[PDB]
Amino acid sequence: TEESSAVQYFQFYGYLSQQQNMMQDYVRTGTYQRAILQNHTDFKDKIVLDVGCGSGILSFFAAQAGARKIYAVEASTMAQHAEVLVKSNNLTDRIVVIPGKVEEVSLPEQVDIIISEPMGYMLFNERMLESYLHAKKYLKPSGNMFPTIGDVHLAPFTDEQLYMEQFTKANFWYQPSFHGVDLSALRGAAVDEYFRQPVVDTFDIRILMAKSVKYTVNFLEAKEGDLHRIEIPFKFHMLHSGLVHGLAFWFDVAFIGSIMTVWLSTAPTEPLTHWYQVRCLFQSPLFAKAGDTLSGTCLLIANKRQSYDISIVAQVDQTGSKSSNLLDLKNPFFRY
Template identity: 50%
Template sequence: MYFHYYGQLLHQQNMLQDYVRTGTYYAAVIENRADFFGRVVVDVGAGSGILSLFAAQAGAKHVYAVEASEMAEYARKLIAGNPALSQRITVVKGKVEEVQLPEKADILISEPMGTLLVNERMLESYVIARDRFLVPNGKMFPTVGRIHMAPFSDEYLFVEIANKALFWQQQNYYGVDLTALHGSAFQGYFSQPVVDAFDPRLLVAPSISHVIDFTKVKEEDLYEIDLPLRFIASVGTRVHGLACWFDVLFNGSTVQRWLTTAPGAPTTHWYQLRCVLSQPIYVMAGQEITGRLRMVAHDAQSYTLHLTLSAKMWGPGAEQGGVLQTSSCKLDLKEPYYRMSQPQAYALAQDQQPHQLIQTQDIPIQSQDLEDIELLAQPSPSSGAQLNTLNG
């Protein structure tokens, strides 16, 4: 089903028309011609072949476009329709785990990101391609990924999800009492991660980040990703869950360019993702929120998400370190609720200051060779993000 989906032109068009995605890839390649000129390139999961064509435009010596789905035939047609570039591109139909290539690559290019960065588990194929095809110290576009997380408050969303289960509260549905299934339906709706674009003012604490260095991460490291969470609430409110987004870095020799899916930035086809708790927790400004997000890979090319958030005791007489409230949920990243609404203008509480919108300008990287991965986790000066860097 995965290869069938990406073998259809309408889905490729959806991705190509994401101008943030496609334009950032184009800029990252063309602005870093020095990394591509005269080099051998492997395009991992080439799809329509657009990234292969970009690499050829940048002067690549030869590009091997590896694609397992039926889209490989469309890629051949598209590339052949560009004769000035097609002589230097070979489409190889097959999985990167299985195909054989006649030479090693100086640089890999790919678009392996799914929702929450890891959905569809193509990052594993990207890492396998690195180990099979890339020369030592070869470059990878993208080079690094970051998952950003922050607690949020969204009463509208919570009520919207809870109301879906109202159908099962009917006591006389054609003479049948449905209420016995209401609890199960209620939990079922809250097991779906929400994919939409939201207003960054809904965030109630600065974000933290988890860094995955694609040049170093091992395939097995991606089977289970366990992230400790710690936030300081900036406002007193009900916390409805955890908001997540990602960005990736193209660490070129000439220009370092980021592709971001952050709230407040131009919307991409990835949108953002939110894990909504069926039992919200209450916090005061300055209160510590702790928890854990555990992502476990499964056979449907996605992940099961296990989220726990807790608010510690607050106020006079609270026991040291005592936990007042804890709420947990289990979600299937493969079965999201595609809400897709554009951000609404939410009214702010009187004591709530709007978080500064996350900026989309390039973030300078001081370390060309990525030896110090902590440098990559520093936000732009205007983002105000508090980062907790974890090794990929």
């Protein structure tokens, strides 16, 4: 099941329209260019590896900041288009497009710095951070990585409207006489399938019932295998009383340069990006009072479809009110 979804993934990224959609996100493109250009000393006369370069934009940023040689690896057919852009911008002596997967190609040389845009939904979808970490085999002993660190933020939320939307969709299968047919036997199954879907969109920050818990991956130290099973303990101190309908996820990445640390944030308090935010709904919400603690674990298991199985166990400590939920990030509901 891994090979087929990998084929579909790279076919999806072979399209210029996807490159345009991602490049038109000005937060992404502008933050990356700021991180690279304001840290020009991390690129001046340096060797760069651009992992999953796509159309090559990050490599062009590296060249703008003064890089001597940039190896831009790309496994999709977009590599060819990148080469076209390298020629038409007269950067053939500085940007070397290397077609293929970063786990299989040969570089002639170790690099001073690795740059990439490997973030997916919840920072981890598409599992490309594993390729980003794998590329560290080419990194000189004290080399740098752009982005350097990644923070996933989790926070309980209340949203009755979203819960009722999904619950009603599931309740379609509560009908006992749909065109004279009893569907009710499948209702449970339907509910399960509907609540396994993470909800990808934005929201007002006032739905957040507690301060976010932060889980940090240091890309300078993380190993690829570390991303196969990600265990995130959490303990929220509730600031508002009400129903917890689930957990909201967003992420920031930090480019820790020798001049400046530049943050790319997809937080709901920041301008919207094409990453949006992700929300895992409980099949049944948990009541809590302000001052209570909501504690548990979010376990992300990498699956062979370049996504994650999400398991959220969360309990209100004061009453012992527990919730266990399973989700699949490969079937997200693009609500917006």
